Every structure is written in structure tokens, then in C-alpha cells.
Swiss-Prot record, chains A, B, C, D:
Taxonomic classification: Bacteria, Pseudomonadati, Pseudomonadota, Gammaproteobacteria, Enterobacterales
GO terms, molecular function: alkanesulfonate monooxygenase activity; identical protein binding
Enzyme Commission number(s) of this protein: 1.14.14.5
pH dependence of activity: Optimum pH is 9.1.
Keywords carried by this UniProt record: Flavoprotein, FMN, Monooxygenase, Oxidoreductase
GO cellular component, one term: alkanesulfonate monooxygenase complex
InterPro entries for this protein: Alkanesulphonate_mOase_FMN-dep, Luciferase-like_dom, Luciferase-like_sf, SsuD_RutA_monooxygenase
Gene Ontology biological process terms, A to Z: alkanesulfonate catabolic process; cellular response to sulfur starvation; protein homotetramerization; response to heat
Gene: ssuD
Protein name, entry field: Alkanesulfonate monooxygenase
Result for mutant: residue 281 to C: Loss of activity
Amino acid sequence: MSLNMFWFLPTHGDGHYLGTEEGSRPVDHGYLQQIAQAADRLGYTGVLIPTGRSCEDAWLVAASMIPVTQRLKFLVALRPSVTSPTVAARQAATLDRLSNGRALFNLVTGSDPQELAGDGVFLDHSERYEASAEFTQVWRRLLQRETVDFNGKHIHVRGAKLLFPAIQQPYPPLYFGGSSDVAQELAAEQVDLYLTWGEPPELVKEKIEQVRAKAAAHGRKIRFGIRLHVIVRETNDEAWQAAERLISHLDDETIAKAQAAFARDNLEISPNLWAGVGLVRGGAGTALVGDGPTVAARINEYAALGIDSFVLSGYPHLEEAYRVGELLFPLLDVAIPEIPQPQPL
Amino acid sequence: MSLNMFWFLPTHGDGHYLGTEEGSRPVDHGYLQQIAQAADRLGYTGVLIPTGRSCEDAWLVAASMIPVTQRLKFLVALRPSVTSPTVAARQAATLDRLSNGRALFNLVTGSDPQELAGDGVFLDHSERYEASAEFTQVWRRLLQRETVDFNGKHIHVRGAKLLFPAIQQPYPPLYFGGSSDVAQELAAEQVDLYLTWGEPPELVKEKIEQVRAKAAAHGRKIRFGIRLHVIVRETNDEAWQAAERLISHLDDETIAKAQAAFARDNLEISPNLWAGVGLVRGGAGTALVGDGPTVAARINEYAALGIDSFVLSGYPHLEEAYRVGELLFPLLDVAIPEIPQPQPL
Amino acid sequence: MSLNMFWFLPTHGDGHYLGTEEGSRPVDHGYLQQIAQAADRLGYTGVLIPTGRSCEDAWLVAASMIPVTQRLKFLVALRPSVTSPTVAARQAATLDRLSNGRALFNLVTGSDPQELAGDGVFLDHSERYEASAEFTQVWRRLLQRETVDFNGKHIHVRGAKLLFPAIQQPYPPLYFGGSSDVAQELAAEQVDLYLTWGEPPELVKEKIEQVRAKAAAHGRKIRFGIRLHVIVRETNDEAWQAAERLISHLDDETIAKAQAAFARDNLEISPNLWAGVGLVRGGAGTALVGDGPTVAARINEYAALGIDSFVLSGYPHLEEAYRVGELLFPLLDVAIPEIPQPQPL
Amino acid sequence: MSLNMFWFLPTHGDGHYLGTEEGSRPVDHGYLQQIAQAADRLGYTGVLIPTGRSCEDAWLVAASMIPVTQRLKFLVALRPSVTSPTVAARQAATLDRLSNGRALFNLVTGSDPQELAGDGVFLDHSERYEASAEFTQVWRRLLQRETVDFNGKHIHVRGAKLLFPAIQQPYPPLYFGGSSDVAQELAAEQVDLYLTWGEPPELVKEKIEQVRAKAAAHGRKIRFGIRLHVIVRETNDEAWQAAERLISHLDDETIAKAQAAFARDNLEISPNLWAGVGLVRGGAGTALVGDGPTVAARINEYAALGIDSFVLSGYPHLEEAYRVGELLFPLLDVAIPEIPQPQPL
């Protein structure tokens, strides 16, 4: 069990400070390329490329990194009702073929009705998950070379088929997350890896056992991954110091309110698990803060729960990819990806 | 009036012979890259990247060519009902930003109900054009930074907006074609360049004057482009010889039937305008066959009709991009693209 | 015994015709890149990059192709007296490290006193080979991590050492050729592969047995390679036709004189071994002309002599790399290179 | 007078700490590429690529960065007696042509007899400068398309000529430095820019006026550049703190000895000019330490002396290129390079 270390492409903006354009860094192809090549050479298994109206399209970003990376994988978001499962399967096959089998998919059920309404989607909190199950069903079948005639509540295709096969078999891996029971069931029945948030190890445990169980109910077993922000430094004080530094430009009310929300600094919801990174939405909710060993221990503790993937992030993303790769990778049993050999002609 | 010369990326397959896997050439990223960099260095304005279930997704292909080209533009297809105009506007903005303003869009109203039904689209020959007009309306507004509330027969978005602006102003150029009166009207009212097929100069003339007129009816004037396959050689015999060579593996019945279809070789529907390339669908319908001067004359004759863009192609596409660029470009007034300077940081 | 197929980078110019600027093609980085990536993807083991005042520096050309190729090797020329063996060893180590072990070296003893005098070298036909042996001696030792104190007739270094080791062990392969007895002895004692010209199989045989023998005299066995130009077509007539076409712009006197030089068309010194490509210096002396099978047979016949490498070429070099890779590779047992995995960090 | 900002490629090693392999970072093509593309996108005019047995060859490194950068220039070292001026002119022309005019040359007269003896050079402290003048003379003439017959004390070529011209006119810029009167005279008579070390502004002044004067004595005027290491932070304390941090792993004796060497911390030889970076050889001798304004002021003060180029560096080099580009560039009048347009075909 070697850990698959993932990084993140900040397609909605990057910088040294949370909640401010101060110290921010413009994100263009050039900068995105720097991060991707950094992850590619440092041994990261892949990078998560976010979705949302607030990000540049993840699929195109991923594709524009193909000729400039050789072994890094791209975990791009799949958005159900927003697009036709047939078209998404076709794009999936193309991303996989052009990158020579380095595509990964992460289904994301929309949760912002206003965003969804902007795309032409109008489904209640339930229908959104119903359409997601139907979409995922069709998608997966298409990637398995099947011709699909499907007429469900939300999805309706007739004689849908992909004329080009993907490289990876049966099909490119599919990740999905969510704590709602409905989300856990969708994963437990169709995805390959259930991606959970970074909660204290005990709560993480509970959730895995729940999905592991739901998974079993279908005669299936899935993998697990955790999303964590990382602020690793040489010592624990520099680490915590870097944490305070990160949110130093946040609104005084925000900071004040957070302390009130955490009534039992108040941000450390567990030893070296700081919720200060979640005071602004757009990234991870928690962050492992500490020195190499402490961070590597918290990580190993999660791995011991059955988690083989760790989608990490840091500010700024170019510099911190190096920080983590140099202070953390050496203390862990990191799985090192290989450059796929050219497909025969 | 310098002519904008375009090439084609054969995303559905390439080779030395029509209608056979004999002499064919596998099309992967590597090969697609060869062609794109060849067009980029030879001075082509851009390359058309086809759409259809038979092609690999044009958008991802285009994106994967960004870091490997510097001035070449990508004319990718826009497919209405198949996708949400909001999502397509968002991808359009991202392709334009990542490539630094080198994105071009070519609207394609689907015509194969079976393909469409495979994607989840079920619209008659009319509704297809109605949904196209509504889609194009919304798309264009989105790229102009507008928030769009739209409820038409087919399109329905509420509060749709792009958070990232495209580079090109007002928005990335939009091409569209079609001889049906309904298609000509759509172009005449929303697109920037009307792309016509390569018909004898007289019929091409007529069509341009029709759209030019329809365009005027809206207090608008549009540009014109023509799609032509090219078989230029040092002499006219090598040219015609290369033409015969191209379709030498076609089915005997096909060849026989074509001659019967052309009752007034029979393929030369006009001096040096050979319809032999249209005996198999997937590419251009006609081809300018002849030596440099003859081809350059036929081309100039079309330019004299008001056509400033020429989307060309040849088999194989890598070698023929060089053929055309070396035997033809020197005899024409080719517009040479520039490498956009980096956007300020 | 899989055959290692090599191509050639035309760093002194390329085109469709010999002895004329007519049909020529400007050679810049872009074009050189096209050829290198074409060889890289088509399965060629590597490319020979020529030396001489008439070529752009092979080492820099090779280096500028590193980020744009992944498995292709670069066989660059090593020029003795022109440069310090210490500096050449240091550059050798750097080319090998930056390309991740894809450097190959081909020693070339200068033969043009005027070129040599232009570089500051003034050695008779003998001293040139004496300095070559001394240079090669030092070079090889340096690449084996040795500190070298050497004082010979021509070479004199004291405490020379490379602080960086090459990737390949013992050191990057070293090729050398030449029919003179002195050259055969140098190879037979220091190089890894003796590169011979394409002479009729019988004369090729004789030469190999001579060097194989000289090699044995040192308790060494070396490999063998042959330099051949290739004009392979679908049929033998197109092949011979392409051959005539190639030299159609040569001076009438040249052609006339060649026929006189071959007294026993006159160019075919052996079945399908045409000396027409040697009527202008700068490339290979002979060319295998014929269809796939005939060419593949002539090639296999050479392989049967103990030749495992074939440095090929064709005009133009981009198009013909494809010609050979598609019409010839399928008929042979071609060794397919691998993408080296990243060195550990 | 916009300032040309240069960075440095650490081809002999990079890291977070001076004088230790602790916190060091392996330097390969991948990492070198990261830095070069970072400088290229951040607006740096170019990067200095060091020379010496302790570095990987600068010319090959520079060349391997051509396809991965678009406007950045490469200032590579020229080493006189080590190589033939004819060969160096030929490589110079090739680097300039392949990169499309982005080559810069920095003559370096060797000073380590043991290094020189390792390369085959045995010249006293004088002859080294005599051979440098002769080498530079020939080099420059060769790049101006001249055929050179030269017979001096050390250099001897007959009928030396470059068959390929460089892109830049008259020839690629030539930098040179040195405080010895002999070095100042060589610059004052042949180079385009005299590169001086970062000494207190008053001593820098004096030196410029000396060379400016020597330059005038030849009816010539040259440009000036300064080599400075930079540790810019948000505040002056973080800056000085980062400085102390940098040399925290240095040998206790070294630190102790330095304090003794500076008898009048002791390292601050002038306000915000820290000599702590010179306690280990291999990089710059001094460093501007301070916040944005303080650093930008020290820099402007140097510019006011007639210095238009600033070759900067920082540890680590990838992260600090960003540090300087983000905290410093905004406070200065930085000259922004352009992407050269493709040469006509």
C-alpha cells in the first residue's frame, strides 16, 4: 500500500493570502503549467482540477497540459445534468486517448441551484442525485463500449455509442464523494474511489466503514481518498506560524465569527488539523499543520483507515507542491507513477 | 486583402487513400501535433477541427495543441442542442484565454437524427435551426459579459453568466455555413463569417451575394470563406495523377456510380475543380487539382468573389500541408499570423 | 537481433532535389523539431546529426530537441583536434544527463585540411589519426570517472576530471567508421560500433570481417552499422522513378561525368543499390531503391552480415521518415525504443 | 532607461541552505526548465548560465531551453583558451539561430590554473588575458561574417569563416567583467556591457567611471550591469531573518572567521548590502537584503550610476524568481521582453 499523492491546480486563483487579492497571483496557462510540471516531476500521482463557474474549464485545462507532462494524471470533474452523458463519455475517451491513459474522473453533483439555473438545470436536492445516478450509469456503460438506449426520469438517449475506446480498462477511474446518505450510496454502487473530507481520524473512520459497508451490500469494494490542505514546515512553530500568516488578511469579523463557531486556535479541531483554511470557500475545509513527522504521522494514521489517495493543496500552489514533495514525501511510502509507453502504431 | 489560409486536423483518420484502411495512418496526439506545428510554422492562419461521433472531441484536441503552437488558431465546432450554451460559452472563454486569443468558433447544426438521438437530442429539421438560433443568441451574449435570462422554445437559462472574459473582442470570431435558406439567414444575422463549400465560381458567387444581401437586411456585413480540398503538384498531370491515385482503392461500384451521377473525369465539375474527393463522406466535397499557378488562379478567382478565408485539406494531411505551403503560398498573397504577446501580469 | 533504425537530421539543408536550391526547404529549429518528433514517434532508435562548417552545431541541435522528444537518441559527432577532450567529455556528460541517457557519440576524424586550418588544426593525414586515438583515449577515461594525466604527441591534460557522471554505463556508446586501415584499427580498439558505408553486400562483408578480426586482436568484439539513403515506394518503378526525380536538377555535366565514372543506370552498382545520391557530397554515398520487400530484403541481407544498426535518410527528410517508417518498418524486425523512466530524486 | 532584469540558472546545485547538502535540491533538466519558464513568464530579460567544471555545460543547457521558452534570453559563458574561437563562433551562431536571436555571451577568462590545466590550458596570469583578447578579436570578426587569418601569440587560425550568420546584428551582445585593470581594458575595447560586482554604490560608481573612461579612450561607450543576490521580503526583518536562515548550516568556523574578516552583521558592508552570501564560492558575493522599497531603492541607486542590467539570484532559485518578480518588479521600471516573430521562410 503505497500512497498516491495528488496536488491541486488552482484554476480559480492562487496566492499567499486567503480572502484577499493582496499577494494573489494571476492564474494563466503558463502558471498552471508550472504547477503541473512541478507535480509531474516531484512524483505526484496526479492533480485535481476543480469545477464551477468560478473556475476555468477543467477539461480544457487538463488537455492543455498533455504535451507538457508525461506521467501525471488529471482528475477532472464530471457534471451530470449540466451536460449530456454521451458527450461527456466521448470527451472522457478523448482525454484518455490524447494523454495516453492519464485521465481520472471525479463526479460532482451540483449543489448551487443558482449556478445550476445559470446552466439550464432546475432539479430539487433529490432529483439532482437521481439524475446523477442515471448519468453515471450511462456514462460508465458508454466507456465499456456499449450501445445504450436509456430512458429514465432525467436521462434519455437512444442508440448512444462511443466510436473511440478509452485507453484505461474497464474505463478511466471514477471518484465521487459526499457525506449525505444518498451520495454515499451512489459511490457505494458505481464509483471506484470514495473521496472524503479531512475530518478528525475518528469521524473519517466512521464514514469509511459506512461506505465500505454500503459498498459490500452490492458485492463491491471501493477505494478511499481524503482531501487535505497541507502546511508542512521544518518545525511545528513555523507550520502554525505559516497557518496564521495565511489568514492574516481575512476580515476581522470573519476571524471573530470563526472563533465563536468553534466553542468547546479554536480552529484546531484535532491535533494538527486546522480548520482555518475553510473560512473562505473554494478550497479544502481542513489543513494538516505541523512539521514533517507530525504531518506524516497524521497522514499515516489516515492511511491506516484504508485511504490510499491524498488530494493535497497549499498556498501558493507552485511553491507548496515543492514544500510537500520535499518535507513530506521522504517521510512517507509514496507511490511513484510511471511514464506510459507509447501505444503501438 | 491578404488571404487567411487554414488547414485541417484529420481527427477521424488520415492516410494516402480514400475509402480504405490501406495506406491509412493512425491518428494520435503525436501525429495531430505534427500537423498543427507544421501549419503553425508554415504560416497558416489556423486549422479547422471537425465535429461528430466519428471524430475525437475538437475542443480537447485544440487545447492539447496550445503549448506546442504559438500563432496558429483553432476553429472548433460548436454544437447547439448537444450542449448547454452557458457551458459552451464558459469553455469558449477558457480556450481563448489559455491559447491567448487563438480560438475560433464554427457553429454546426446537427443533421444526423441518429447521431443527435445518441446525444439526447430529438428535434425536427426546423427545430434544429430554431434551437441553433436561440443557442447562438445566448452564447454570444454570454461572451459579451452579459448576464442572460432566456426562455425560448428550446433554450432556457436563468441568470447565466461567465465569470471569466475571453481575450478576443467582442468575442472570439464565429463562423457558420449552409446553403439552406434557413442557415443563410442564421449566418446573415449572427455569425461573422459565412463558410461556403467549393462549388464552381459562378455558383459560389450567387450564394455570397445572397448572404451578403441577407446580411445587409440586418444592417450587417459578414466575411466569407470557402472549404476546399487541394491536390497541387509541380505540373497539371502529376496533380490529376495524384487525384486518380487518391481514390484508386475505392469500391468499383462507387466509382461506377459516380460516373453515372455526373452525366452531361465526369468528376471535374469545373476546370480543375474535381468532385472525386466527395465520393466518401468525412472531408471536403470538391478539390482544386492542378499545378501551382492553376490552383492559385482558381483560388484568386474565389477571392475576387469576396472570400478572404480558405479552409484547405490534403492526403496525407502532414505532407500536404507542406505541399500547399510550398507550391501554393508563394503564388498567393497569404496573410501571415503573428505570435500574440503575453498578456500583462 | 532486432534492427535499430536511425534517421538523419539535415542540418545543412533539406529539399526535394539534389544539387539545387530549387524545391529546397529552409532548415530551422521548427523544421528540425518536426523531423526529430517524427522519428521519435515512428519508432526510430535515434538520429545522426552531422558535423562540419556546413552544418549547424550538432550538440546544440541535439540539446534543443530534448524537451520535445522522449525516447529518440541523438548520435552527434565528436571532433578530436578541434576541441579539448576534457571539454567534450564534460559536454558529453551534460547531453547524456539532460536527455536522460539518450546521447550517442560518433567520432569523426577531420579530412579537410582547409576546414581544420579554419579551426586552428594543422595535422598531416597521419597525425590526424594519432591525435584522434589520444583524444578518444582521454575522452573515454574521463567518462569512466577517472582523473586523467595525459601527455602524448598531440593531447596534453593534467588532472582532468568530470565532476558530473553520465547516465549510460560505462559511458555513452561510441561509434566510428572509415575504410582506411588506420581508421579500422582505431575502431577495432576503442569504439563500440563500427559504422560502414553502404557498399554491395559482398564488399560490406569483407570490411566487417576485417574489423571483426582487428577487434578480436584486442580481445574485443564490436557492433556494426551501415549508412544508407532510402528511396522506398509502393512499387519498384515508383522507387526508381523517385530516384531519377531526385537528381533531375543536377548539372548536365555532372550526370554525364557520373555515367563515364561507372564503366563496366550505371549508378546501380548492385541490385537496388543506386549511387546517384552520391553525385553531390553532404549525404550518403548509396541508396537502396525499390519497393518495400526488395528494400527489406537488401536490408536483411546486410543484417545477416552482422549489422544491427541502419542510419537511413531520404529527401525530403520529414516526409521520407514517414515513407520508410510506413513502407519498410512493417517488413522488418525493428527494435522499438522505450521512454526512459525519470531518474530518482 | 527601463531596467533589464536577469535571473540565474543554478547549474551547479540549488537549495534552501548555503554550504550544506541539507535542504538542497537536485538540479536536472526538469528543474532547470521550471526556473527558465518562470523567468520567461515573469518578464526577466534573460538568465545567466554559469561556467566551470562544477557546472553542467551552459551551452547545452541553454539550447535545451529553446523550445520551452519564448522571449527569455540566455547569457552563456565564453571560455577563451579552453576552446577554438572558430568553433565557439559557430556554436554562437547556432544558438542564436535556433533560439531566434535570444543568445547573449559573457566572456570568462579562467582564473583557476588547476581547472585550466585539466582542460589542457597552461597560461600565466597575463597570457590568460592576452589569449582572451586574441580569442575575442577573432570571435567577433567571425560573427560579422569575416574570413579571418589570425596569427597571434596564442590564437592561430587560417581562413576561418562561419557559413551561417547569427540573427542579432552586428553580432549577439557580449558581456565581460573584472576589476583588474587588464580586464577593464579588454571590456573597454571589445565588449558591449561591462558586468561589475555588487559593491557599495560608491565603489561601483568609481569602477564604472574608470571603464567608461577607458571605453572613451577607444571612441567607444559601453553599457553596465551589476551582479547581485536578492533576499527581498515583505518587511526588513523577514528579509534579514531570511538572510540569517540561509547561512544557518554553515560551518561555525566559517561564520566565526567571516566576522573577523569584517572588522571596522559585520557582513552588512553597506546599508542592505549583505556579504553573507559570499561565504561560500559559487554564487554572487553580495546580496541586497530588505523589503520591496528598500531593495528597489538600492537598485535604483545603482541604475542612477548608469547600470541598465541586473543579474539577480536567490535560494531556492525557482521560488525566489517569483519572490523578486512579485515583490520587486512592481516597484521598478522593468523592461519587458518581446517574443521575437518567426523569421520569414
